[PDB]
Symmetry: C3
Subunit: 299 residues, 3 copies
């Protein structure tokens, strides 16, 4: 069930465009496009994406920024839209469909800090999210987190599921075929990957012995909850949804609803390879294990 007009389509990834236009105003431009992604070795999914990545590119703004967002729809036949969980907006005015080969621009404020999902909001929403149109926007708190001075390194990890291609019965009633992690870059040099079963096993995240690591995490679903755990450590501090006031300490595992986020911080005390899992182990067996390699130097 590949739509006839998508057969043979594979649009190259387009970089996110982003520029600050005032102390509290930021322009962001993203595309909706159809891009082949290898989600498991030998298995291509012709994903519906923002900017040719699934999950989509990371967006980072500051608390109190107003976002002036443009979506250019490169899909030749299906309309697409954008819903940022970070913003206050009218869904029926500001998260509306952009037609094929057209652009739309919408403006809305991000006044809460945290780790928010974004996704396409075109009906049926389950079809658009399951085919790949999901991502994270981080809204950095104006006053930071209480533990910022202790953090040595930070990474972003996103969990998603993949089902049988564009199969609405399976999206509604089936078990996931794969559950996967991806990482998105906060700064130049950091890994930026798609949701697949293998890249973060073959090319682990790096750290050095003794460091306190912060992960910004979100489970975009579409359908499952997550039981997020790093093997070999305990979370020193957890901020639910990345809001600094929702503080928990000393958690072994952090549940996340579908679309839920967190900031989690932990210390790695010995060199070695540390798996990162969802502890719902049927999903870990179906791809959701990433690796952190901790060395004496960090390289």
């Amino acid at each position: 069930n590949v739509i006839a007009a998508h057969k043979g389509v594979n649009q190259a990834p387009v970089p996110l465009k982003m520029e600050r236009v005032g102390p509290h105003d930021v322009h962001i431009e993203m595309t909706a496009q159809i891009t082949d992604i290898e989600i498991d070795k030998g298995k291509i999914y012709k994903a519906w994406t923002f900017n040719g990545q699934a999950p989509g590119p990371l967006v980072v703004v500051n608390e109190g920024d107003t976002i002036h967002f443009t979506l250019k729809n490169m899909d030749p036949v299906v309309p697409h839209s954008m819903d940022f969980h970070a913003v206050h907006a009218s869904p029926s005015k500001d998260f509306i469909d952009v037609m094929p080969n057209k652009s739309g621009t919408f403006t809305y404020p991000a006044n809460k800090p945290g780790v928010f999902m974004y996704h396409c909001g075109t009906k049926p929403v389950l079809q658009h999210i399951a085919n790949g149109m999901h991502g994270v926007i981080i809204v950095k708190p104006k006053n930071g987190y209480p533990t910022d001075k202790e953090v040595d390194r930070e990474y972003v990890l996103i969990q998603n599921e993949w089902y049988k291609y564009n199969d609405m019965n399976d999206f509604q009633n089936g078990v996931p075929s794969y559950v996967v992690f991806s990482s998105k870059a906060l700064k130049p040099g950091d890994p930026n990957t798609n949701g697949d079963t293998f890249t973060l096993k073959e090319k682990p995240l790096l750290a050095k012995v003794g460091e306190k690591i912060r992960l910004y995490i979100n489970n975009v679903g579409p359908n499952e909850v997550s039981s997020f755990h790093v093997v070999g450590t305990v979370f020193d501090d957890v901020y639910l949804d990345g809001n600094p006031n929702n503080h928990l300490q000393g958690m072994q595992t952090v549940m996340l609803p579908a679309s839920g986020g967190a900031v989690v911080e932990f210390t790695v005390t010995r060199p070695g390879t540390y798996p990162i899992v969802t502890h719902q182990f049927n999903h870990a067996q179906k791809g959701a294990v990433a690796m952190l390699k901790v060395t004496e130097t960090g390289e």
Copy 2:
């Protein structure tokens, strides 16, 4: 698998009866009865209910009230019972079966504030809850919530699932056929509906631009968790189980276990239609989307 003695039975809804008999004592009388409910267009489920609604009628009492509860069982063949999560009681003395065409009266205190499930407790409990015998009791806190002065409007929403009719294999091992929201009235004029796939899309909840809305929510299950989210906003304040001490701020999505409740508050800043979902999107696709319509006047 409709029990022979229920074929042709459809008992009209009976109003909840409730009266205060002392500063801290309240009488409540409810029925158990068998009532046809249209859960999706064209699809009748011959539900097992309290008072002919599923979920059942809303009960609201004050912290510290003792409830003197009578159940009249109008089912001609199956016994029924009541378990309120709000109360301290002996299950084997106070949540016992009432036989067909009989009444029972039980007395127990509600000393904790919150948003509690109630349900039938007759074995097998899964069969009695899945066939419709669930509901919410709200216990209002003696000293309110810290944010009461900011709240402009409030509604109650309940999430439940429906399965294949009276099919114990499906109740145990199947995926839900429908997942639905209903609303129950806090005051005259407010919507009071059953768990179906369409009423709160066709007849949305109303609000005005700029208002802070409070929802009292509970996921009665029977089997699924919920990832509750309002599109276009972020929750300013969340009180888990409706206890004022379990305060979280700035959540995008609130997980609820089966039977879990919350009070959530959020601001609507622009006119439009705002979907209310569980963000486990397979369940939203199977009915669990309600609408909030925000106008310049509230009408």
Copy 3:
């Protein structure tokens, strides 16, 4: 699909060995062994276990203890390992496989209080956990919990699932066949049972009217979350993962991720039998109901 070398093997349970060797140092020795357990009446599962129990024996240490742990692998063909969620360790050095008929010793610190899962960490981990190699380690806080002076009795309860025997397709893609509770002894005389559908119904936990009960609970999974609830009461105080700082009050139901723990406290006000459930009622129907019997004397 019983491995040829396990046909006919049923190793008798071996007691946990544990001794303190310094103010902050404790030796623990456990076995990995293959033991038949009756998980439902008439149904034997040839479990992969620690010490012949599934879940495994309870381990209790103090915050700040270093554990010097030895695993003796009595399985004649499959390697096994131990991962304690309580500790900081290098997974690729300290949670490594011990071969058949060999021993390994590993040393690591437990510096966080709480109710932690332990399990085998040998690939595929889902197979080793689902076949029975799970358990709990409690790390008692140095300064106790704020509510310790109010607690009259305490018990440990663990929830797990069972699937079709050693069937990796079912472990990954199937619904559980059984979901069960077990209790592990904190002191001599307390019940110590395996995860089965019947023992804690036939031989309930005991308490006396008026007591405040503390349960240390963990949901080891492997795959499901839990909605933990005691019928007839409300939790006065909840400490997520058993860390004293993660305090919630007045909860009807406590969600637990897979591997998540809690300390929950509640008061029983009337004599009777009080069911303990996961409120995801398909799992309660498949075994996950235990009983607490409350008498005027406690006997």
